[PDB]
Amino acid sequence: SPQPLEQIKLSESQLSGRVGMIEMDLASGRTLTAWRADERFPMMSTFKVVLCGAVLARVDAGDEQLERKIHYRQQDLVDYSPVSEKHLADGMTVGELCAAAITMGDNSAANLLLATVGGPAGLTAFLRQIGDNVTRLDRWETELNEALPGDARDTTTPASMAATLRKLLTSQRLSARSQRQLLQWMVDDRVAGPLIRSVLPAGWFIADKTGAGERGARGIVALLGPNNKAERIVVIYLRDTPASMAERNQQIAGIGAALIEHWQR
Ligand SMILES: OC[C@H]1O[C@H](O[C@H]2[C@H](O)[C@@H](O)[C@H](OCCCCCCC3CCCCC3)O[C@@H]2CO)[C@H](O)[C@@H](O)[C@@H]1O
Numbered sequence: 001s002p003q004p005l006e007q008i009k010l011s012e013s014q015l016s017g018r019v020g021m022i023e024m025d026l027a028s029g030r031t032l033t034a035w036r037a038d039e040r041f042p043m044m045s046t047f048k049v050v051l052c053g054a055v056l057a058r059v060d061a062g063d064e065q066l067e068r069k070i071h072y073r074q075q076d077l078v079d080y081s082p083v084s085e086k087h088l089a090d091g092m093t094v095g096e097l098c099a100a101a102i103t104m105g106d107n108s109a110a111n112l113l114l115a116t117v118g119g120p121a122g123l124t125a126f127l128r129q130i131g132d133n134v135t136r137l138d139r140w141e142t143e144l145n146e147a148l149p150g151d152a153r154d155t156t157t158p159a160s161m162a163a164t165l166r167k168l169l170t171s172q173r174l175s176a177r178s179q180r181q182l183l184q185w186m187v188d189d190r191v192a193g194p195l196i197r198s199v200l201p202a203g204w205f206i207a208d209k210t211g212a213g214e215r216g217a218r219g220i221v222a223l224l225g226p227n228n229k230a231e232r233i234v235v236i237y238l239r240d241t242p243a244s245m246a247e248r249n250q251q252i253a254g255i256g257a258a259l260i261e262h263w264q265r
């Protein structure tokens with residue numbers, strides 16, 4: 001494979017869409033690769049990691065418990081709720097909801113959690129409170145995945161998202177236990193995690209949260225690194241491409257391949 005930046009470019013050429021990407025050292029925040037890092041991209045499902053970071057902040061403050069069981073109704077369900085639809089009789093704990101939202105892509109679980117943090121406005125306020133002055137959530141699932149051209153709603157920038165994820169996972173804004181919990185949820189992704197490992201060379205660590213939207217919107221926020229260590233944060237977003245899901249998946253994987261083949265930078 002070619003150099004990371006050259007592959008990113010090749011991907012835009014092949015997809016006819018915009019690619020946004022940041023490769024950052026998790027421990028220090030050193031930015032290695034940055035492409036359209038300050039441009040807006042729909043967060044799609046990747047917003048759920050930030051969402052649960054806000055939930056954990058409430059837990060740390062004593063205003064929430066991961067054990068707290070929430071009982072909801074069928075009318076509360078939205079499109080795609082593989083886990084939540086199975087618990088209309090017994091409910092789900094806040095912690096279970098975060099696991100379902102992040103590891104299983106459960107949309108209703110996400111909306112329930114979003115309500116606990118003050119909705120889209122509440123999560124955005126949380127982002128502002130941790131120093132992210134760019135990322136914004138405006139809608140709920142599943143409308144937040146609309147990805148209309150030129151629409152600033154429900155967007156982030158590669159640079160903002162990488163910085164925010166790093167803050168949540170390592171800046172000690174969240175308690176030690178909470179940082180560990182957020183990390184384990186990403187490690188436990190059941191949607192793309194297993195597939196990625198199946199194609200990663202031996203020795204490479206992966207933790208992630210992926211997302212998809214309309215007009216070819218696609219994205220992934222991940223932790224990657226050799227020697228089984230979460231060495232770097234890698235954020236990749238795609239938008240405005242008419243390509244098949246398969247090809248969009250292939251292009252993102254291709255960027256990953258370039259990073260893997262040219263890691264020491
Ligand atoms: O010399 C480097 C490596 O080259 C290949 O590894 C290939 C692998 O066979 C392929 O499956 C993967 O595609 C990428 C697989 C992962 C896709 C998702 C990666 C994510 C990570 C998080 C951010 C977005 C990308 O590329 C690598 C690098 O060429 C060899 O098979 C392996 O023996 C060797 O160690």
Ligand SMILES: *C(=O)/C=C\N[C@@H](C(=O)O)[C@](C)(Cn1ccnn1)[SH](=O)=O
Pocket residue numbers: 044045046079080104105145191210211212213
């Ligand atoms: C967030 O994850 C956005 C989309 N996820 C879908 C996808 O990746 O294509 C899923 C198939 C879940 N979804 C309507 C989302 N109808 N199913 S999954 O792979 O997360």
